Every structure is written in C-alpha cells, then in structure tokens.
Amino acid sequence: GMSNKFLGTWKLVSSENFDDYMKALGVGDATRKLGNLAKPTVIISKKGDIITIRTESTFKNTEISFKLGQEFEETTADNRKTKSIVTLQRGSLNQVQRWDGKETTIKRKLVNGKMVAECKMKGVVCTRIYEKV
C-alpha cells in the first residue's frame, strides 16, 4: 500500500505555477492572491485502510479521508464539490477530482525525502514541494 514515508507533517517550501493552476480551476483574483501567499502544512495520517490528508493554512483548511480506489465526496479549498479517487502508481499517490464535466489531478510522490505535488489542469502543470517537519 501507501509507503509509511508519506505519514507525517509536511511544510510547503516551494511552489511553481500555482497562480496559473488556480486560474485553470476558475479561482477569482482576490482568492488567488491569498492562495499564492499561503504556506500550508499538509498532514498525512492513516487509521487502518483509511488514509487522511489534512491541509492547514491561515486562509483555508481542508481534510479528505479515503480508501485507495474508492470514490468519495470531496470539498476542495476553493469550495468545489468533487467526486474524487486516490490511486497508487509506482509509489505515487495520485488524486483525481471530477466536477461539472471537468477534471484535475494532484500527484504526490516522495523524492529524496521531499513530497512533490504535481497539480495538472488542462495544459497547466503546477509543482509544489514539501519538506518533512
């Protein structure tokens, strides 16, 4: 299953192309301004086969609990009501969000101890790097 190296508290240290990714989601100007200034902490925890990913930031908090491969209702930070699935592909934790005929992916993988989150929407790719704290 998911590597236990995912479990723990993660702090954003780098974000690239987040503004254009938010635009792709349809996020308004003022919201993106605070979204680009946020330095969220991500906590990944596990209770049995239920994985929990909590994101904490001054602006917004989110939390999703899921089992690999099983669709679930999700509310994103920008307040999208999506049906989402998390899968494992070569150790990569890949989350797909679907809503209003749209689709975006957030792929999380471990690289030299860092967690690297690739966010894709249409032809827009955003990379966010976290470090274990």
Ligand X SMILES: CCCCCCCCCCCCCCCC(=O)O
Q: Which among ligand X, Cl ion, none contacts residue 115 (Cβ within 5 to 8 A by kind)? A: none
Is 90 annotated to bind a ligand? Reply is no
| Distance between CA atoms of residues 27 and 78, nearest Å | 7
Q: Which among ligand X, Cl ion, none contacts residue 78 (Cβ within 5 to 8 A by kind)? A: ligand X
Other CB atoms within 10 A of residue 130 CB: 21
- C-alpha gyration radius of the chain: 14
Q: Which among Cl ion, ligand X, none contacts residue 119 (Cβ within 5 to 8 A by kind)? A: ligand X
8 A C-beta contact, residue 68 and residue 52:
no
User: CB under 6 A: which stretch of 43-51, 52-60, 64-72, 81-89 binds ligand X?
Assistant: 52-60
Establish how many alpha carbons lie within 13 A of residue 87's alpha carbon, considering only the half-sphere containing its beta carbon.
9
Which residue ranges make up the site for ligand X (CB under 6 A)?
22, 25, 27, 31, 35, 38, 40, 42, 55, 57, 59-60, 76-78, 106, 117, 119, 128
